[PDB]
Write a protein that binds this ligand. Structure first.
Ligand SMILES: O=C(CCCCCCC(=O)Nc1ccccc1)NO
Ligand SMILES: [K+]
Ligand SMILES: [K+]
Ligand SMILES: [Zn+2]
Length: 356
């Protein structure tokens, strides 16, 4: 009944190597360590994913090219540079999410955590949006060995298109994504009209949101969706992506959330008493991202954290106030109340078909 914390010094060091988020994995772990939360969790060393394990979703052609490129020097472009050691990076995170999933299967825990995972843009044969490997999909595929129905919830700023498309043709996995949706904003997909294909029709849920949304309206909207989804789909396990690029102070500067708002969503999911795999994701204000996931780690543990940031390796990065709480920015909420309701109505309508 003690939460599992996927961690090892080698794993964090590996994750720090991603140029898009340098040293972020260390900052997140160090802050969690500084709050001594790791002593209240079961620490499990992540296995490195094998070629066969990564192949459960990704094509052999892609996996081999990724390795070849990684050894010496398919979506490898601006967002996903073909840099050396990138296959080792991909295998590590994939294996970490799988390890967490296997922990859920064994009954070792009710909640397993991998903050360095949640890379949800990767397709079976294509890297996309800083994602070389879709560890979230790999996590769901592993869970499907034991659980008959999986619910995937994506609270990242960006649409979880890679996870959605991976399961868009099946009805055993339902994907739910709350994300910014606006013409020109990555990845451009995930309108409310997108519900899946074939036998997977109505088993993909998308909630388009505009800039400036804050804790209260986000939670109410998220709860009402999850409420209908839970009763309609009746999941046996949950995969939860909690990308922190929605948090105020993120350079993306889109949503205006605090970890408290996201935390309430997490609480509502945690009370389902189901096997839950926790993943990170986006988050480009490194200190704030550590703040968020440290806070959420405390929420999972049912602990109240000291407002003042404890001294640690990255203490200087937490100026100028050096506290745990994050203050929302002073900019408008661009979401019209009537639009939110209609999106909700479409979703309720689609979930009527989920009566099987
Ligand atoms: O958080 C993410 C990462 C998505 C990939 C990034 C979107 C494209 C983008 O914003 N690119 C960019 C921005 C600033 C400077 C250079 C590239 N996914 O959830
Ligand atoms: K999302
Ligand atoms: K689906
Ligand atoms: Zn994102």
């Amino acid at each position: 009944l003690v939460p599992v914390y996927i961690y090892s010094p080698e794993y964090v060091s590996m994750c720090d190597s991603l140029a898009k988020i340098p040293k972020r994995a260390s900052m997140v772990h160090s802050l969690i360590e500084a709050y001594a939360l790791h002593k209240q969790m079961r620490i499990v060393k992540p296995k490195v994913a094998s070629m066969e394990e990564m192949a459960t979703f990704h094509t052999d052609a892609y996996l081999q090219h990724l390795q070849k490129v990684s050894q010496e020097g398919y979506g490898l472009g601006y967002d996903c540079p073909a840099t050396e050691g990138i296959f080792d990076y991909a295998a590590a995170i994939g294996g970490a999410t799988i390890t967490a999933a296997q922990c859920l299967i064994d009954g070792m825990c009710k909640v397993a955590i991998n903050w360095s995972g949640g890379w949800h843009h990767a397709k079976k044969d294509e890297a996309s949006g800083f994602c070389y490997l879709n560890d979230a999909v790999l996590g769901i595929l592993r869970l499907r060995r034991k659980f008959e129905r999986i619910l995937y919830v994506d609270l990242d700023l960006h649409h979880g298109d890679g996870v959605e498309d991976a399961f868009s043709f099946t009805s055993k996995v339902m994907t739910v994504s709350l994300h910014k949706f606006s013409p020109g904003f990555f990845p451009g997909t995930g309108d409310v009209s997108d519900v899946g294909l074939g036998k997977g029709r109505y088993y993909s849920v998308n909630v388009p949101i505009q800039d400036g949304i804050q804790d209260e309206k986000y939670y109410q909207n998220c709860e009402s969706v999850l409420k209908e989804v839970y009763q309609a789909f009746n999941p046996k396990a949950v995969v939860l992506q909690l990308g922190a690029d929605t948090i105020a102070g993120d350079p993306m500067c889109s949503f205006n959330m605090t970890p408290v708002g996201i935390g309430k969503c997490l609480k509502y999911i945690l009370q389902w008493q189901l096997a839950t795999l926790i993943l990170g994701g986006g988050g480009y204000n490194l200190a704030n991202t550590a703040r968020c996931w440290t806070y959420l780690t405390g929420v999972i543990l049912g602990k109240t954290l000291s407002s003042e940031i404890p001294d640690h390796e990255f203490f200087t990065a937490y100026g100028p106030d050096y506290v745990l709480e994050i203050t929302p920015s002073c900019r408008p909420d661009r979401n019209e109340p009537h639009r939110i309701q209609q999106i909700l109505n479409y979703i309720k309508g689609n979930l009527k078909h989920v009566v099987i």
